[PDB]
């Protein structure tokens, strides 16, 4: 009902979330993006009528059900990575197991004694889609692996 666009008209819906019915940039106060994990809900600059980016939220920052953390405003690595570890391999095929780096030895749950100054002894579970065992499958909602 706005558009190329009509003269006095500042844009269309169709262009973006942050255009009114009426064909006008939104307020530099209006959501647009709805908040997340890594990433802070979004806000309109009243000057386009694209959403623009969205500020990543701390880097080191749970995500996907304290399975893996914030990197850059994406869910990436595993829980693994905020203790200085590194996810391995444990059935229990779908826990999060991590171990000090080239040190294979040291591979235990999250909910083992050690770790237990990081995970407070808790058994965190991979969620179900994740990978399992190096990559061979992924996890149930069942929590078995492939």
């Known amino acids: 009902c706005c558009y190329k666009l009509k003269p006095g008209k500042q844009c ?3 262009q973006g979330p ?3 019915a009426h ?8 959501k647009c993006r709805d908040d997340s994990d ?3 809900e979004g806000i309109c ?3 386009t009528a694209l959403c623009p980016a969205s500020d990543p939220k701390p880097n080191f ?3 996907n059900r304290h399975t893996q953390v914030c990197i850059n405003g994406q869910c990436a690595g595993s829980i693994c990575e905020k203790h200085g570890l590194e996810e391995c391999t444990c059935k229990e095929l779908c826990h999060v197991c991590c171990m000090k780096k080239m040190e294979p030895s040291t591979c235990a749950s999250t909910g083992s004694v050690q770790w237990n100054k990081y995970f407070l002894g808790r058994t965190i579970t991979l969620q ?3 990978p399992c065992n190096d990559f061979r499958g ?9």
Do not use: L
């Not at 992924?138 to 492939?146: E, G, N, S």
């Open 12 to 14: 269309s819906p169709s």
């Open 18 to 20: 942050c255009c009114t």
């Open 23 to 30: 064909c006008a940039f939104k307020s530099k106060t209006e």
């Open 38 to 40: 890594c990433a802070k």
């Open 45 to 47: 600059n009243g000057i």
């Open 61 to 63: 920052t749970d995500c």
């Open 128 to 130: 179900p889609g994740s």
């Open 138 to 146: 992924y996890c149930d909602v069942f929590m078995r692996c492939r």
